[PDB]
């Protein structure tokens, strides 16, 4: 029973945007299931994008139906979203659902049951950075990792490959005049460990295929 | 944003509250069922409410559902501070606009106390510093309500120059956090004896500092 969102976290405008999804526990034509895409712009409410079902068959909403196409592959169990001659309003978070039917005189559009975890596709005519990891010291001791300059967001920060749960807070990217971001990570942890633990952050850029691994030392 | 919802709504714990959602005559009008969607901060929506009034498994009793006219609600009894969430409503359309209509979403606020912010200020890197370049970082987290002053000071004199400061984000504990960055050359950074970042949240003011010490 899980959906994985994949593809591109940054495409220009006037360029056709290529989403997917895997699917997994289930199968893609299997009857009695739809599988649709929900977008969400940065603190903005959902918005149904379109909706295949088990057959080919596609269904889409009238706001976006000229430049929006949905596919399934059966074999591969996999969705795509294409959405062609991209604009600004078109940054959003966009999600792959699994959409449930009532069968009367058509078959009914229903409850979204299963979501999964969108991608953040920044539409824009810059080119994705990678950021310039550097660390910061402790001082019962605070310490942490600095992601700078780097675009577009997202930025998954890591804690001893996983391992360093307690005490971590990662903090909102800010947006540079540059136009780039910035973003921070810090762990809370007992000053007794600072010399006896080792203590690695490991930033992950999917944009610009990054990941930064680093060391975090006292002094 | 087809069908309406309140942009907000708010409570205190062990109360009961209601989310509406009314649309025009395709939409619920019609008799289409209406779903409800919950979604934490920064997270993927889940499914709360299905057809009208029904709980999947995995949701509490304290939560219910109820359609009636052009209207549909959410009830929510017993109020928890885990309830704080951005709520959702579904329902089929007939009308030019799609099948599948969405309402404008409502941002529930659960009632919390004041919290004062935690602020930890960390001086330029040593490796950032041998890029010619400078940056000091100012976080203050887990604090409500999400309102903030952030003031830069080189040694007693205040200077709003190179400033990068963030808006407010509440956290899985629903509490806000905010980040500000100052961006100096090396050499300011060293020719002053001390920074100082300094935030005011509710009439009383965290002010950390550091200055360059190496070690």
């Known amino acids: 029973l899980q959906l994985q969102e994949s593809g591109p976290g940054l495409v220009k405008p006037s360029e056709t945007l290529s989403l997917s999804c895997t699917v997994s526990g289930v199968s893609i034509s299997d009857n009695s299931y739809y599988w649709g895409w929900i977008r969400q712009p940065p603190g903005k409410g959902l918005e149904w994008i379109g909706t295949?079902?088990?057959?080919?068959?596609?269904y889409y909403n009238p706001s976006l139906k000229s430049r929006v196409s949905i596919s399934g592959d059966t074999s591969k169990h996999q969705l795509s979203l294409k959405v062609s001659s991209v604009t600004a309003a078109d940054t959003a978070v966009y999600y792959c659902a699994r959409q449930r039917i009532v069968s009367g005189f058509v078959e009914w559009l229903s409850k979204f049951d299963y979501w999964g975890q969108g991608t953040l596709v920044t539409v824009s005519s810059a080119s994705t950075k990678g950021p310039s990891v550097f660390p910061l010291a402790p001082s019962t001791a605070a310490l942490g990792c600095l992601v700078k300059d780097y675009f577009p967001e997202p930025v998954t920060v890591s804690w001893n490959s996983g391992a360093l749960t307690s005490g971590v807070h990662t903090f909102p990217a800010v947006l540079q005049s540059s136009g780039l971001y910035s973003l921070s990570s810090v762990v809370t942890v007992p000053s007794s460990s600072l010399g006896t633990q080792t203590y690695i952050c490991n930033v992950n850029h999917k944009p610009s295929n990054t990941k930064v691994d680093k060391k975090v030392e006292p002094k | 944003s087809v069908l309406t919802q309140p942009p907000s709504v708010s409570g205190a714990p062990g109360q009961r509250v209601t989310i509406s959602c009314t649309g025009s005559?395709?939409?619920?009008?019609?008799?289409?069922?209406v779903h409800w969607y919950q979604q934490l901060p920064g997270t993927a929506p889940k499914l709360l409410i299905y057809d009208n009034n029904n709980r999947p498994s995995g949701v509490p009793d304290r939560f219910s559902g109820s359609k009636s006219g052009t209207s549909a609600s959410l009830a929510i009894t017993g109020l928890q501070a885990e309830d704080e969430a951005d709520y959702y409503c579904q329902s089929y359309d007939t009308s030019l606009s799609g099948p599948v209509v969405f309402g404008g979403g409502t941002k529930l606020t659960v009632l919390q106390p004041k919290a004062a912010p935690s602020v930890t200020l960390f001086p330029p890197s040593s490796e950032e510093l041998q890029a010619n370049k400078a940056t000091l970082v100012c976080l203050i987290s887990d604090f409500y309500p999400g309102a903030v002053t952030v003031a830069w000071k080189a040694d007693s004199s205040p200077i709003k120059a190179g400033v990068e400061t963030t808006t407010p984000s509440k956290q899985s504990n629903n509490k806000y956090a905010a980040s500000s960055y100052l961006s100096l050359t090396p050499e300011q950074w060293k020719s002053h004896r001390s920074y100082s970042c300094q935030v005011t949240h509710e009439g009383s003011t965290v002010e950390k500092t550091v200055a360059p010490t190496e070690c």
């Open positions: 005559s395709s939409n619920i009008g019609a008799g289409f069922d």
């Open positions: 295949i079902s088990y057959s080919g068959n596609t």
